[PDB]
Structure formats: structure tokens, C-alpha cells
Amino acid sequence: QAMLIGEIMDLNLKNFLEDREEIIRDAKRKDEKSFKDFKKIVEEIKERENKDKIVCDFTEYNPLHKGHKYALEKGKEHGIFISVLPGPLERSGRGIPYFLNRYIRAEMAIRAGADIVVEGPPMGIMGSGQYMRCLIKMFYSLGAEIIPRGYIPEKTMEKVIDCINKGYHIQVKPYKIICIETGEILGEKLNIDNYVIASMSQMIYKLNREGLKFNPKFVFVKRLEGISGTKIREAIFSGKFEDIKNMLPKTTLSILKELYDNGKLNELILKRFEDRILETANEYDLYEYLPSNVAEILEKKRPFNNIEEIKNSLPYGFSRHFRERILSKLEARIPNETLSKYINNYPAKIKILAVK
């Protein structure tokens, strides 16, 4: 096993470093042909499926559980299904490594029914407003007409859905979920899994105000369960895959069970390159990779011996996402200039991870 663990580690690093180069190229150039190539693929798929509409969703599929597959299949009743599956650097909406790489997650998506899987943005080095702006821009660029989203039912979600179904949009403030156009306060809070819908709605409103002509229709899929991806991943990391199998569809188990049965799954689980993080924290001009205030604080307190000391050196009271984003930035070494450019030019290309 030592040689195999080494190959896997080397591949993870090489993939990470190729991703970084990809981000740097996309910051400076649009690949116009990829957009034309995508358009041709969609036309062909629509022809074959006898469907006229493009259905898109933001899908981490980390891993793809029964609720995800249910939502996907319901989405497909409305058109061809495109999974927008992040992303370069393999750092997630939570700021952290994905459980498995995106090629594996894309194969989960195709097996579950996705017609096309498009590579999503490098989520983990962005704030959540930044990555949501990117996601909506990708949906626009793909020609998305329907967004089929799974939700956890609750009384505030009834009112959110009523607001959206009237053609209105959601704003989120602390302890307020608002129907922007009517001003109505719909409730104080959503289930944590439901904030993605509110966030998408709010960003669509913002981008429309800024001139983006984009008005997709949401299709809401009431989930039959409250499966938590965090809990699924913790069980698998702890060696308790067998305890959570029942929450995963056979199409996801068709990949995971063989790996697990053969003692190969654990080794594939992605983790941080902590040496890179320490090397950037200790040796680089932190002002070119991090925000000023953070660059100042960490530069004062260095050198650090470990990630924990970096984390504890960060300003007090800021969010877990913030701390994980800083770590991902230290890890990725993408200059602020080039990330800004990346976000402003996004999407620079449509990369197809997999197609049915």
C-alpha cells in the first residue's frame, strides 16, 4: 500500500497544481470555442432526449445522496439536466476539501441521471457572495431555463415559494427573510439547506438590477428526508460507511461500495496540503494573496508551526467559512489581482466533466 498511497498523493497535488494554472489562464482569456462546443452538445442532447428546455442546478454531490437523486429526476421531467459541479482546487462551498475529486463526483452525477456535468467555480477561495455570483453567471451562460432545487419543508419555505412563484425575489437579513418586491417579512429563518434557494433568488435580483437579462423558473422539489452531507462525510471519514449506506442511492453505491469493500475508499478522501499552507503563511508576501487586515495580522505573528496556530491567529469572531477560505487561499497561492480578474471574467470557459 505505501507505493499506492504515494501515487494517489502525487496525483492529488498534480491535479491541484494544474487547477491553479487553469484558474490563472481563465483570469486572462475567454475560450470562446468552448462556448460554441457546449452549444453544439446541448443541441444534440436535446434532440436525442426529445426535450426543449435546459434545467441546471448547483450540485456539490459530496457525495450524491438520495435527496440529490430525487431532485435530479424531478428536474429531468422539465428538460435536460445539467449538473454544475465545482471545482478547480477541490475546495468547496464550505471552504474545505471535497470528500472525493470532481471526476468521481461527476461520474456519480451521470450514473444518477445527469445529462451533462459542467465544471463549477473554485468555490473554496471565494466568499459565498462571490461564488453565488459566479454560479448564477454560469447558469446564464449555459442557457438555463429551469432551476430544480430540493428543499426541506417548513412554514417559511411555503411563503418563499409563494413569493418566487409570483415572479418576486428573496432578500436575507439577520432574522428576516423578505419578499423584496412587496416588502413582506416572510419569516425569521430557513433550514440551513434552504438558504441556497434564498441566496440564488437574491443574486438573480442583484444581477438583474446590474443589467443581466436572466429569469429562470425555479422548480421546487420537496425532499422526503433531511439527510445532512456533513454527517454522511463524518461517518465515512470515521470508517462508518456501512452506517450511512441507506442514505445513498444504488447509483452512488455502485462506485463507493467497491472502493470500500477493497480498502481503497479512505485513501482517496481529499485533505489539505498543509505544507503549502505553512510555506505561504511563513514565506510569502501575504498582502498579495490575502485581505489587508489578515495579511497584517498573520505577518506579525509568523512563523507558525501548524495550521491551528494560523487559525487561532485570525481575527476573533469571524466565521468558520472565513477561516477555511483563508486556509484555502494560503494553500492555492492565487494572487488577489488574478482572482479578482477571474471572478470578473467568469465564466471564461465551459468545461464538460462528463456527458451522457
Curated annotation (Swiss-Prot):
Domain of life assignment: Archaea
Pfam families in the record: HIGH_NTase1, HIGH_NTase1_ass
InterPro entries (alphabetical): HIGH_NTase1_ass, Rossmann-like_a/b/a_fold, tRNA(Met)_cyd_acetate_ligase
Sequence intervals crossing the membrane: none
Residues in the signal sequence: none
PANTHER family the UniProt entry points to: TRNA(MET) CYTIDINE ACETATE LIGASE
Family statement: Belongs to the TmcAL family.
Entry protein name: Uncharacterized protein MJ0951
The species this protein was found in: Methanocaldococcus jannaschii (strain ATCC 43067 / DSM 2661 / JAL-1 / JCM 10045 / NBRC 100440) (Methanococcus jannaschii)
Lineage: Archaea, Methanobacteriati, Methanobacteriota, Methanomada group, Methanococci
